[PDB]
């Protein structure tokens, strides 16, 4: 549940925090609005696991596998079983136009998977964008009654290392791996004022990735509905934002600041970007794909 | 109010966060449980002021002025008017055995003061300790219906610099200025197992000061009631914790981790400790006093 039951941590033995030693010297670990930026070295997972297990936390994970992207499910789910929220209650929600294509992946105790059938749009842009509507449609259907937090990710990915309760918070976004070191004017925000996703050149905190966001069910409902409604205004006006759902996500998180930000450890592409010294772990990574082949019949 | 009304920030122009530049190189700015540690340089007050003003936030400030400590009220309140939550709604709650001794301090718009008459205990230790019971007694009386957050401080103090909405969170404690650089075994926790405040030598995150804590009304109610109930168990067992309410506060915050920690900028004694380089601002500081004289007839 969320809202903090009154509970007490047990005695624990762990290293004392070091007030006069920074946990990272190379990166920003807190935003200007006092949201943690989650990097390895910022958290003691044992403390966090205790806190969230005592609250009996259930995490939902949404993933869309539409048309040829069903091919990504087996590795996605296998690796989620190794690395995502292990020890906590997990409910996977696989949205697909092909239920019979969902692989039979063996789940650990306390973990379940539901298949949600949805329609397939022709254009990959529309498939990607309509995730906001579909996630918002399923808050009342399932999520409010089944999970405490939702984590909403791309399927063309694999887990390689721990992704756990350190991410959980009312609202989070993830630093896009292409832009974490970039100046805001280089961010690929929507720059046309005729779109609802428009962000001027002198605004913006971060460039968040569309492939990994989440929060409490309430906050995810708000985000997804807002982004969908904004998309529909754009469609009525004959404009499609340059990066689709990601552009609208960025507008939303500029205006509604996240309560945690995940570092690019949580959203990476090793083929394109290697393994920089600033990433102590590569947690959730792109699986190589040929856009043209996989997005079209 | 608290619980986040759906609201949007206006357009704002401010410096871009620097992902690859730490906001402080000299101090820890986030705890191992991902609570911000509030130091100058960690926050953009303009963003935070927007967030909290859009939620129409009201902050209660409790202060006890019992027996001779009424002498501290005028400077406390005058300086709070200059530095505490300016621009936000504030409700001061002055607990005293002498209502006629509360000075007539001129308040800014949107700020009010209530005088709450309470009994005076003989021993200063009991006066200090019984604040927990009294704060807890006033959650149902006033606070739940009047304020969003409570800030609970010593009176023998003055504000010298900004203390604002950067502190606000469900539950906060403050690093005691005598111990922020100390190892845990040097912390003056209660070390006798026969007290409810007992903390073993291999446990503890920080040594929090009894003179400055707070949070949402709900969380402050929980803390104060727990500390009072623990005090009463100790009294029945013929033991008084070594540092009184501070010892019980430390036990509570070990077991129930705060969601922000304030640096010693927020609780300082310049006479005893000077102005170290690590303090960029001295915000809330001790007023010199002679313990023996001021605590006794
Ligand atoms: O034919 C498609 C196109 C997209 N997607 C979903 O939409 C997400 C976003 O698209 P994609 O991963 O192609 O975007 P990219 O990471 O390349 O920007 C995918 O991970 C899938 O979950 C899908 O299921 N089928
Ligand atoms: O006779 C007394 C003793 C204590 N206090 C209150 O209890 C707080 C804690 O006591 P004190 O400041 O003496 O503790 P110290 O800061 O010296 O540890 C004071 O700030 C007052 O708010 C009081 O009002 N009258
Ligand atoms: Mn993708
Ligand atoms: Mn004091």
UniProtKB/TrEMBL annotation, chains A, B:
Its main location: membrane. The active site is at 246 (nucleophile). Keywords: Glycosyltransferase, Manganese, Membrane, Metal-binding, Signal-anchor, Transferase, Transmembrane, Transmembrane helix. UDP-N-acetyl-alpha-D-galactosamine binds at residues 64-66, 69, 154-156. One of its GO terms (molecular function) is metal ion binding. Binds 1 Mn(2+) ion per subunit. It is found in: Membrane. An alpha-L-fucosyl-(1->2)-beta-D-galactosyl derivative binds at residues 176, 188, 246, 269. GO terms for cellular component: membrane. Mn(2+) binds at residues 154, 156. Its cofactor is Mn(2+). It is a single-pass type II membrane protein. GO terms for biological process: carbohydrate metabolic process. Belongs to the glycosyltransferase 6 family. This is ABO blood group (transferase A, alpha 1-3-N-acetylgalactosaminyltransferase transferase B, alpha 1-3-galactosyltransferase). It comes from Homo sapiens. The chain holds residues 54 to 344 of 344 of the full protein.
């Amino acid at each position: 549940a969320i809202g903090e039951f009154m509970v007490s941590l047990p005695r624990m033995v762990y290293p004392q925090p070091k007030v006069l030693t920074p946990c990272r010297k190379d990166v920003l670990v807190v935003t200007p609005w006092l949201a943690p930026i989650v990097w390895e070295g910022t958290f003691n997972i044992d403390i966090l696991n205790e806190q969230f297990r005592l609250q009996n936390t259930t995490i939902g994970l949404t993933v869309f596998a539409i048309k040829k992207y069903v091919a990504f499910l087996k590795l996605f789910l296998e690796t989620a079983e190794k690395h995502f929220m292990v020890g906590h209650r997990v409910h996977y929600y696989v949205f697909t136009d092909q239920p019979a294509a969902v692989p039979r992946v063996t789940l650990g105790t306390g973990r379940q998977l539901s298949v949600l059938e949805v329609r397939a749009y022709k254009r990959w842009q529309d498939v990607s964008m309509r995730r906001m509507e579909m996630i918002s449609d399923f808050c009342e259907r399932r999520f409010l009654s089944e999970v405490d937090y939702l984590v909403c990710v791309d399927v063309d990915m694999e887990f390689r290392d721990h992704v756990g309760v350190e991410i959980l918070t009312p609202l989070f976004g993830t630093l896009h791996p292409g832009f974490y070191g970039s100046s805001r004017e280089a961010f690929t925000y929507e720059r046309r004022p005729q779109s609802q996703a428009y962000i001027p050149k002198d605004e913006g905190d971060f460039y968040y990735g569309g492939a990994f966001f989440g929060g409490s069910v309430q906050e995810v409902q708000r985000l997804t509905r807002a982004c969908h409604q904004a998309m529909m205004v754009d469609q009525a006006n004959g404009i499609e934002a340059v990066w689709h759902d990601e552009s609208h996500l960025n507008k939303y998180l500029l205006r509604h600041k996240p309560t945690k930000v995940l570092s690019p450890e949580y959203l990476w592409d090793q083929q394109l970007l290697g393994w920089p010294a600033v990433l102590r772990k590569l947690r959730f990574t792109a699986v190589p794909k040929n856009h043209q082949a996989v997005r079209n019949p």
